[PDB]
Amino acid sequence: SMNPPPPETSNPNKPKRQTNQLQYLLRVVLKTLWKHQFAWPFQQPVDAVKLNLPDYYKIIKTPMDMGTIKKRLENNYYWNAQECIQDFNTMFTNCYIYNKPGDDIVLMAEALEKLFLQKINELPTEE
Ligand SMILES: Cc1cc(-c2nc(Cl)cn2CC2CCOCC2)cn(C)c1=O
Known part of the structure; x- marks a missing residue:
């Protein structure tokens, strides 16, 4: 393959x-997820x-990962914060599509996804 x-x-x-939202997404959301023990x-x-x-890649036709999201933020690929948030959601969903409940990777995704929601919670307001 x-x-x-x-x-x-x-x-x-x-x-x-x-924007303040895009900066928050890179420097607060992504950065905190990135440095988590289960980020790797x-x-x-x-x-x-x-x-x-x-x-x-027979099952996952919309792949996404935090390395890609990071580079996207650093290169101003996102205009709207929601594009970034969508990518995170896609990343987690992929994990739940491919993997089985109780798998190590699923537990790691759950950890990251919880922390994600904690951080997006305090996202600055839209201009
Ligand atoms: C199927 C799959 C594999 C990996 C992955 N990347 C690296 Cl690097 C290693 N692994 C696999 C191990 C990671 C630690 O837990 C055990 C499996 C990541 N994701 C999101 C998946 O859906």
């Missing part, structure tokens, strides 16, 4: 803006070849 190319992270033709399986795309998961 093969991995797909990673999701796009920097589009120089898209318009760019810096979510910091880059699932390498289905190295992990020997030949069905991964």
